[PDB]
Amino acid sequence: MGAVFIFVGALTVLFGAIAYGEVTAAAATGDAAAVQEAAVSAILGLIILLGINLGLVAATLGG
Amino acid sequence: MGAVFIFVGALTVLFGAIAYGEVTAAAATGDAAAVQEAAVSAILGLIILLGINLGLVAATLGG
Amino acid sequence: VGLTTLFWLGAIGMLVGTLAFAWAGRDAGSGERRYYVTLVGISGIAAVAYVVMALGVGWVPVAERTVFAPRYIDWILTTPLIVYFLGLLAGLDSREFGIVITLNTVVMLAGFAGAMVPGIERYALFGMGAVAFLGLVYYLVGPMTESASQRSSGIKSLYVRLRNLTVILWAIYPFIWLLGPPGVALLTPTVDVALIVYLDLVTKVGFGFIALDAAATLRAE
Amino acid sequence: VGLTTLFWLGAIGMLVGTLAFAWAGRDAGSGERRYYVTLVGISGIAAVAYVVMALGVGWVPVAERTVFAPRYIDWILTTPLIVYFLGLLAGLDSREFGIVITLNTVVMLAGFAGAMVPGIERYALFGMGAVAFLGLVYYLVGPMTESASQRSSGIKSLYVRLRNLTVILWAIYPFIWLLGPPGVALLTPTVDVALIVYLDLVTKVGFGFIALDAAATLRAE
Numbered sequence: 108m109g110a111v112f113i114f115v116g117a118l119t120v121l122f123g124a125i126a127y128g129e130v131t132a133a134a135a136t137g138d139a140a141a142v143q144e145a146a147v148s149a150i151l152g153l154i155i156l157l158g159i160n161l162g163l164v165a166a167t168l169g170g
Numbered sequence: 171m172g173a174v175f176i177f178v179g180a181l182t183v184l185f186g187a188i189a190y191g192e193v194t195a196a197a198a199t200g201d202a203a204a205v206q207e208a209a210v211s212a213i214l215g216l217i218i219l220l221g222i223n224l225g226l227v228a229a230t231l232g233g
Numbered sequence: 234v235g236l237t238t239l240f241w242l243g244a245i246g247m248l249v250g251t252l253a254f255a256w257a258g259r260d261a262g263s264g265e266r267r268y269y270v271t272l273v274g275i276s277g278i279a280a281v282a283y284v285v286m287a288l289g290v291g292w293v294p295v296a297e298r299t300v301f302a303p304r305y306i307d308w309i310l311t312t313p314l315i316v317y318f319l320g321l322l323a324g325l326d327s328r329e330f331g332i333v334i335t336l337n338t339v340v341m342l343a344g345f346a347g348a349m350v351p352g353i354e355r356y357a358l359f360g361m362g363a364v365a366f367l368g369l370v371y372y373l374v375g376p377m378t379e380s381a382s383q384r385s386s387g388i389k390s391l392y393v394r395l396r397n398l399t400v401i402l403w404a405i406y407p408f409i410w411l412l413g414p415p416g417v418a419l420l421t422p423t424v425d426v427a428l429i430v431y432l433d434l435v436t437k438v439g440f441g442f443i444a445l446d447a448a449a450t451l452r453a454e
Numbered sequence: 455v456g457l458t459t460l461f462w463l464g465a466i467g468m469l470v471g472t473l474a475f476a477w478a479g480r481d482a483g484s485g486e487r488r489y490y491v492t493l494v495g496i497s498g499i500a501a502v503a504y505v506v507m508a509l510g511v512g513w514v515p516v517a518e519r520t521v522f523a524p525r526y527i528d529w530i531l532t533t534p535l536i537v538y539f540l541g542l543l544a545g546l547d548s549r550e551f552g553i554v555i556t557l558n559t560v561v562m563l564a565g566f567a568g569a570m571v572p573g574i575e576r577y578a579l580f581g582m583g584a585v586a587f588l589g590l591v592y593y594l595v596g597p598m599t600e601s602a603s604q605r606s607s608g609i610k611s612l613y614v615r616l617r618n619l620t621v622i623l624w625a626i627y628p629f630i631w632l633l634g635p636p637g638v639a640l641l642t643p644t645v646d647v648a649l650i651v652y653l654d655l656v657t658k659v660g661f662g663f664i665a666l667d668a669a670a671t672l673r674a675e
């Protein structure tokens with residue numbers, strides 16, 4: 108389970124970094140609507156990511 | 171495990187909704203930097219949320 | 234969603250737990266009573282603290298941020314009750330109880346003090362809390378686990394499950410402190426509060442429900 | 455991070471899996487060979503598809519979005535291999551294999567076709583895929599599970615674990631289709647690609663590693 112968890116924990120921060128980069132890039136623009144757009148994507152993406160990680164975990168540490 | 175998962179799945183979308191509301195509220199402002207700020211918080215928050223959900227799941231469906 | 238709305242959600246969640254723990258305990262003999270009472274204290278205190286914050290009390294301005302005194306006061310009162318519950322399962326003696334409650338109290342006192350300090354030296358207080366927390370974790374996974382391993386199967390199993398919930402989840406709180414308003418304020422006040430509501434609910438009410446579920450099973454075989 | 459960088463990460467992840475599956479299989483007798491070969495095909499095909507996208511090929515403009523033909527072509531080729539692997543574990547006969555591969559192929563064909571359709575009628579194609587997917591899930595958790603339950607303990611256990619991984623995770627793909635560029639485009643192209651890389655890696659390489667770990671254990675007792 109260990110290798111599974113740090114895989115999950117590490118990919119989450121790596122996904123968060125990608126999402127953050129998208130938000131900062133949109134921020135550099137000065138367009139508020141662009142940032143909202145990148146942010147809505149990041150939020151939906153992170154929610155889906157939970158589903159994936161939870162799915163992976165439930166599937167491997169369940170039976 | 172079922173009641174645990176839909177608890178996790180439902181609180182995630184509820185957290186995503188709060189985060190999204192914060193981003194839209196910042197968007198309504200027209201300030202790009204404000205949106206980045208709300209977005210960075212949402213991203214960090216969602217990453218921490220994965221940790222909580224994963225922690226809860228690992229702890230209950232592990233032994 | 235406003236902060237007060239989140240605080241009200243916290244209060245309701247804690248009340249629901251408290252009612253559940255009280256009623257589950259109505260079916261309890263001399264040996265189990267103290268566990269149910271402990272759970273009631275844990276969620277009851279938290280419920281009141283959340284009401285206090287929802288009613289707009291204890292919001293303390295610190296430099297350019299807002300710290301919630303009742304949050305830290307709740308933790309000071311309820312975390313030693315959680316440590317107590319764990320120690321009962323583990324079969325600790327008074328001297329062992331004294332050590333872990335002391336380590337626990339240092340964490341919560343340090344964290345509260347640090348949150349109330351405007352200057353950079355608040356991180357020294359955080360650091361003192363963080364070291365004490367590593368000591369508490371050691372006690373939980375080492376000595377306390379060894380003590381628990383001498384008890385019945387059902388008891389050892391509950392201890393490990395609650396120990397794992399506690400160690401993993403309590404370890405998240407200092408990151409929320411660091412990233413939230415008391416630290417570098419990268420989490421908004423709203424996200425900070427929302428994360429803490431969820432986390433408090435799992436560490437108190439989730440903890441209790443895991444215990445309730447195990448207690449019913451042990452008594453039914 | 456650019457799209458091509460993500461595609462390269464996908465290709466490397468798939469290559470690492472492919473090398474692992476090939477080498478693990480070097481230790482394999484007549485009974486286990488086909489499973490290892492199947493895993494190599496699954497991750498190998500995916501590795502090449504990712505290279506194709508990383509090299510900037512197959513990026514198809516559709517209205518105001520970009521659809522990746524090699525993504526859908528990969529799925530058309532590799533998902534029936536995953537269904538095949540599961541069917542082997544379950545102990546299916548040719549007629550049973552034919553049903554599930556057919557249902558699987560309808561999902562992937564419908565999803566690819568829908569992604570390539572500019573108009574609102576692409577959701578009808580999605581819908582056709584979604585219904586076929588519910589049929590596939592039924593087959594996986596019903597008939598195929600019943601077939602698997604007649605085999606050895608070690609085999610039934612691997613089947614259920616891989617079945618659970620597959621059903622839960624494959625169910626996420628249509629939501630990414632709907633929320634991403636092919637649907638309402640709420641996910642950016644980058645987030646869309648990043649989610650699919652991770653998901654593909656778990657459903658192919660994670661799947662394979664779970665199988666590798668079980669195979670070693672069965673052979674070592």
Ligand SMILES: *C/C=C(C)/C=C/C=C(C)/C=C/C1=C(C)CCCC1(C)C
Pocket residue numbers: 308311312315340341343344345359362363366403404406407410433436437
């Ligand atoms: C019901 C409330 C619970 C279980 C609260 C737990 C809070 C902690 C484990 C806090 C730990 C902290 C550190 C380890 C460092 C200093 C900051 C703290 C107090 C947030």
Ligand SMILES: *C/C=C(C)/C=C/C=C(C)/C=C/C1=C(C)CCCC1(C)C
Pocket residue numbers: 529532533536561562564565566580583584587624625627628631654657658
């Ligand atoms: C290695 C790649 C894998 C396992 C791909 C799996 C993809 C699916 C399960 C896609 C399913 C879809 C639906 C159920 C509806 C139509 C849209 C699809 C094709 C994305």
Ligand SMILES: CCCCCCCCO[C@@H]1O[C@H](CO)[C@@H](O)[C@H](O)[C@H]1O
Pocket residue numbers: 264265268269272322388444445448
């Ligand atoms: C909320 C429910 C938690 C119940 C956990 C019970 C764990 C302790 O178990 C109790 O200890 C008694 C001795 O003190 C003994 O009579 C029995 O072992 C048991 O009743």
Ligand SMILES: CCCCCCCCO[C@@H]1O[C@H](CO)[C@@H](O)[C@H](O)[C@H]1O
Pocket residue numbers: 485486489490493543609665666669
């Ligand atoms: C990647 C590793 C997956 C190996 C899974 C093996 C599952 C099937 O098991 C194999 O089936 C043979 C009959 O065909 C028998 O000789 C044995 O049951 C076994 O070798």
